């Protein structure tokens, strides 16, 4: 008592839209930057500085904020390749006028991480965008 059925292939092209991608697509090229969402691609040539802050897998700056014990506020700069000591020097020189004193920093050379004491995530993101990373 099996009902009769029709086997067709024409409508199968709709199933292609329902398959999610396993990889992250490269961002589309825009005629004007920055994009309305504020995203901005890195410069075509790499800067001559002796360090490189590699972009995230979602094409964003690896600058984050961290909280510990509920009151310890920190900023984490990740994906740093090169002279992380030079990067720390540049960051402290950039942040000294803002705070009136040398910011407290910790350098993880085996990992390639800079850890500044306090929330300077947006300021560091803007600084890295201006510097071209």
């Amino acid at each position: 008592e099996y009902p009769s059925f029709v086997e067709s292939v024409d409508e199968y092209h709709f199933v292609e839209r329902l398959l999610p991608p396993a990889s992250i697509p490269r961002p589309p090229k825009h005629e004007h930057y920055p994009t309305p969402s504020g995203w901005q691609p890195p410069r075509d040539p790499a800067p001559s500085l002796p360090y490189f802050v590699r972009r995230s897998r979602m094409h964003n700056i690896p600058v984050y904020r961290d909280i510990t014990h509920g009151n310890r506020q920190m900023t984490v700069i990740r994906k740093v390749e090169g002279d992380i000591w030079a990067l720390q020097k540049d960051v402290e020189d950039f942040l000294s006028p803002l705070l009136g004193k040398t910011p407290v920093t910790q350098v993880n050379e085996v990992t390639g991480t800079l850890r500044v004491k306090g929330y300077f995530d947006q300021q560091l993101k803007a600084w890295l965008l201006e510097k071209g990373f």
């Binding site: 999610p20 991608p21 396993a22 990889s23 992250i24 490189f52 590699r54 897998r57 390749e81 085996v110």
Partner: protein, 250 residues
């Protein structure tokens, strides 16, 4: 005829591919047959010895199941009654004669049944461990790229002489692309050797890479490893396990 291998995946503009020699397993003296380029994000990442230790410990431990079990005081045969009355006897008070204090009594805590020490490291951590193992193997001059993994004879002594002539080391691990495609000559040569171990591409791991002093890779194996390891750097999280169909993944 030189054999030249170029990277098949987009290399970041700020990093240059690392060059390596391509040897051959046919002749003793012919140690420079071609040149290959390897992605910096696989063979030239930063050496994370902590990640290597994490991956090695995970490999040693997740498969472990300890079949150790000792009987507690509730599982020893007898000890169902008080050996003597609580008062008047003049000796210490006891309940079951199978208490941990007694001679034939049960174990207080001991090991309890088969214990599974199973945990699964995050996938990106495991991939980074593989990358770091390959990178340190290349950096310490213990990685050698060959082509097609072919041998003239099926004599293990031939491999022994070749290794001691090229100063590869006491232990060599040869990796081929596919299990069924390994040539019979090298298969028979390595079937009779202990320190010369031959594994397929899918059988590469940090534990064996560290166990064996020298790693030998073919060009298809290098390309396969490069493609498999560089996929996780620009991938989404799995909505469902990747064995299921995806738009761009098998």
């Amino acid at each position: 005829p030189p054999v030249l291998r170029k990277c098949e995946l987009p290399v970041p503009a700020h990093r240059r591919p690392v060059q390596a020699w391509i040897e051959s397993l046919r002749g003793y003296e012919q140690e420079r047959v071609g040149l290959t380029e390897l992605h910096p994000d696989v063979f030239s990442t930063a050496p994370r010895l902590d990640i290597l230790h994490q991956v090695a410990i995970w490999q040693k431990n997740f498969k472990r199941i300890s079949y150790a079990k000792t009987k507690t005081r509730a599982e020893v045969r007898g000890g169902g009654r008080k050996p003597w009355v609580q008062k008047g006897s003049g000796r210490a008070r006891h309940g079951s004669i199978r208490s941990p204090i007694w001679r034939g009594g049960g174990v207080a805590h001991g090991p309890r049944g088969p214990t599974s020490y199973y945990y699964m490291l995050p996938m990106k951590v495991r991939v980074q461990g593989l990358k770091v193992a390959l990178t340190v193997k290349l950096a310490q001059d213990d990685l050698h790229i060959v082509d097609s993994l072919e041998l003239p004879t099926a004599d293990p002594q031939y491999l022994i002489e070749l290794a001691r002539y090229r100063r590869w080391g006491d232990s060599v691990l040869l990796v081929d692309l596919e299990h069924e495609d390994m040539p019979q000559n090298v298969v028979a040569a390595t079937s009779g050797l202990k320190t010369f171990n031959l594994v397929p591409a899918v059988g590469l791991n940090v534990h064996s890479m560290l166990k064996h002093q020298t790693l030998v890779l073919t060009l298809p194996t290098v390309a396969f490893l490069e493609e498999k390891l560089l996929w996780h750097n620009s991938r989404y999280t799995p909505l469902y396990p990747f064995r299921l169909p995806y738009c761009d993944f098998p």
